[PDB]
Amino acid sequence: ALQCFCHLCTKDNFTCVTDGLCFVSVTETTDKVIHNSMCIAEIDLIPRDRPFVCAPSSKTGSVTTTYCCNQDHCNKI
Amino acid sequence: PCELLPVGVGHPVQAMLKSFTALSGCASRGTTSQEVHIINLRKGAEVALHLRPIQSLHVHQKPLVFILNSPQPILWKVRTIFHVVEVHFESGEVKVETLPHGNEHLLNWAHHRYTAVTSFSELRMAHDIYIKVGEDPVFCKIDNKFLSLNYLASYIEPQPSTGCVLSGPDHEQEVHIIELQAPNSSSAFQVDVIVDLRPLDGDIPLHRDVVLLLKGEKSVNWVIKAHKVMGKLEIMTSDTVSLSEDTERLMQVSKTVKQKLPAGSQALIQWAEENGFNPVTSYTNTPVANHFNLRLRE
Amino acid sequence: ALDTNYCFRNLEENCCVRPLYIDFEQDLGWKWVHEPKGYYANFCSGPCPYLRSADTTHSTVLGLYNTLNPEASASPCCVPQDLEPLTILAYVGETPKVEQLSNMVVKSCKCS
Amino acid sequence: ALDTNYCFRNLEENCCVRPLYIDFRQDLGWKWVHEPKGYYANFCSGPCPYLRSADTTHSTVLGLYNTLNPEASASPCCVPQDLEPLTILYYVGRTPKVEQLSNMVVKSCKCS
Amino acid sequence: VKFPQLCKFCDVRFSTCDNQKSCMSNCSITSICEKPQEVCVAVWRKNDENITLETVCHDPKLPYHDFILEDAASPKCIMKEKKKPGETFFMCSCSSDECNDNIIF
């Protein structure tokens, strides 16, 4: 099963094992850089054919770059 | 009605009552003057003893004095000075001496070789004893109605229960119904009730689908402790649920929504049948208990 | 997860577990609890931005809604995910009863 | 319970279900949803006083704590208890797909 | 991970669209392309007096109306005039979500 980077998984060397996809998103606040990495389970990828959570999510004001991948430890960008 | 006929040995659900007993004891701050801890065991062999403070400094460097009296030869499994009447450690001092079986003479038996007892405990008969390391400065007068969380003894008495087994193991989903009525003698609110899931043999793990209907009059919180069983776990209950870390890891835990389940055997069996849990394997109706040992068959 | 391990070592403005000690008699006036005198109950606090530990789909939708429409005041809220029991000692008349009170200490939060 | 029958008919400042309609494309930017164009997702809002639909024991403790120590700002929060699914329709090529998205509409709240 | 694109997918529909620079496809179906490699295609045909517009999801490593997709990467759908007998024939393709909804001449 897929091995993703997880910035909240303190207990497990910052990694989770997932059935869906690895996720990463970098938000541009003008006073800090936010790096959210996590797992997204198969049932939480809607619609499975084009999950919205992975979909282009760059709205006005926030330079947010969301990536989804299925290689082990791929969300390191 | 299934709820009124007694169960025997060949029942998957066995009702138990875990409690923490102590007959009498005292508590003092002697370190000011090695800490003296006395256990006056009675008759209802091996007993387990656990040592742990509130862990201020996390290390215990004062050697303790333990006086483990009993009217029985008992192998003391000390788990991470021991005046005794064997002790094992999976810096000891194994001494054999005649100890008085009266509590007041035993208390001053320690006063003869030591300054002032830190804690006295008279226990009835437990295989597990949980004992103090630290020293509360608030306080050695022994009292019949004394209890301190630090010094406790665990016993698990089996409870009577009615119910019946409806279906055999020749099914794809072993669904068990459990109807509790009172979890503890004293009723405050929202007390824990452990359900223990294990295979009947206890040798090889089991891939089983398990539905658990858990209904109680009093508001309980169910705690599922799955051991050597993996697969689908369906929990439907009128109360809340809790899951040990092994349960979520070994099994795929489906969750209740705090259903307004009906009361009685025939009603609860009907509900389970009208909701995809067919056929029901067993029904259990314990009047009072707070621990269930469920054994699965295949 | 947003558990005590993560929340206590990381300066987090957003939804996370917060430490709180509650003295039974001083903070609640509960003389009926004999041992202990207090416990670390903890609590969940902080805003729930989009995709931060969303409990259900509705909380992903609302977190996304409140991202584009912050004024709506309809956002997910920080809430205990995993709780743990606390063993207490209270007297019933003159009988000391050792009771394990379930769901007493918050150990992880979620955004629901 | 604090469900839609009670919460929408009787005015309550405290924790209750609130009506909210979310337009998929206007509120979320969801071009991919064909039918419907939006749905009433609703949300939970309002303060959680002591014993008002307390989810767990910890929320009874915090609700009582925050009653006697209001300045602490550590109170239970209004949160969906029971949610219900929403059936949607979207196209994969020329195929209309009917999907029932679970946990989409909140129908009752609780204090956690 | 390459995910399928959102395209207007109404197949061949009649259109009152001509003598304009920009123009909306007026298509009511936004579809997720069955294959991730597909891109949005718009084709404009004015045979005699009847105008018709077609919106589809389509693999660019493949011909549409026996034509090779040249601009399968451009963001917007800028129509290029192809030559077909007795007919005014325009076609465009693009790689943005709903990019064949707003059609540029």
Author numbering:
A (entry chain C): 31 to 107
B (entry chain E): 30 to 62, 65 to 75, 85 to 120, 130 to 134, 138 to 142, 149 to 197, 201 to 359
C (entry chain B), D (entry chain A): 301 to 412
E (entry chain D): 45 to 149
From the publication, what sentences describe this entry?
Betaglycan (BG) is a transmembrane co-receptor of the transforming growth factor-β (TGF-β) family of signaling ligands. It functions by enabling binding of the three TGF-β isoforms to their signaling receptors and is additionally required for inhibin A (InhA) activity. BG is nonetheless essential in vivo, where it binds and potentiates the activity of the three TGF-β isoforms (TGF-β1, -β2 and -β3) by presenting them to their signaling receptors, TGF-β receptor type I (TGFBR1) and TGF-β receptor type II (TGFBR2)4. BG, and a homologous co-receptor of the TGF-β family known as endoglin (ENG) which potentiates the function of BMP9 and BMP10, are transmembrane proteins with a large (approximately 760 amino acids) extracellular region comprised of two domains: the membrane-distal orphan domain and the juxtamembrane zona pellucida (ZP) domain19,20.
Additionally, in a separate approach we wanted to obtain the structure of the TGF-β:BGO complex bound to both of the signaling receptors, TGFBR1 and TGFBR2. As the TGF-β1:(TGFBR2):(TGFBR1)2 heterotetrameric assembly cannot recruit BGO, we aimed to construct a variant with the signaling receptors bound to only one monomer of TGF-β. We therefore switched to the TGF-β3 heterodimer, TGF-β3WD, a mutated form that indeed can bind only one pair of TGFBR2:TGFBR1. We successfully assembled the TGFβ3WD:zfBGO:TGFBR2:TGFBR1 complex and in this case we used the more flexible TGF-β3, expecting that the bound TGFBR1, which spans the TGF-β dimer interface, would lock TGF-β3 in the closed conformation. Thus, we returned to crystallography and successfully obtained orthorhombic crystals of the TGF-β3WD:zfBGO:TGFBR2:TGFBR1 complex and determined the structure at a resolution of 3.0 Å. However, our structural data demonstrates a completely distinct interface, with the zfBGO subdomains, OD1 and OD2, and the paired antiparallel β strands that tether them together, forming an arc that straddles the edge of the TGF-β fingers. The positioning of zfBGO on TGF-β is responsible for the 1:1 stoichiometry as a significant clash between OD1 from both protomers would occur with a 2:1 stoichiometry. The most extensive and crucial interface for TGF-β binding is formed by the loop from residues 244–251 located between the β2 and β3 strands of OD1 with the sequence PNSSSAFQ (highlighted in orange in Fig. 4a I). Inspection of the TGF-β:BGO:(TGFBR2)2 and the TGF-β3WD:zfBGO:TGFBR2:TGFBR1 structures shows that the BL of BGO partially occupies the TGFBR1 interface formed by the heel helix of the adjacent TGF-β monomer and TGFBR2, which would be expected to block binding of TGFBR1. However, the binding affinity of TGFBR1 to the TGF-β:TGFBR2 binary complex (KD ca. 30 nM)41 is significantly higher than BGO binding to TGF-β (KD ca. 200 nM), enabling TGFBR1 to outcompete and displace BGO.
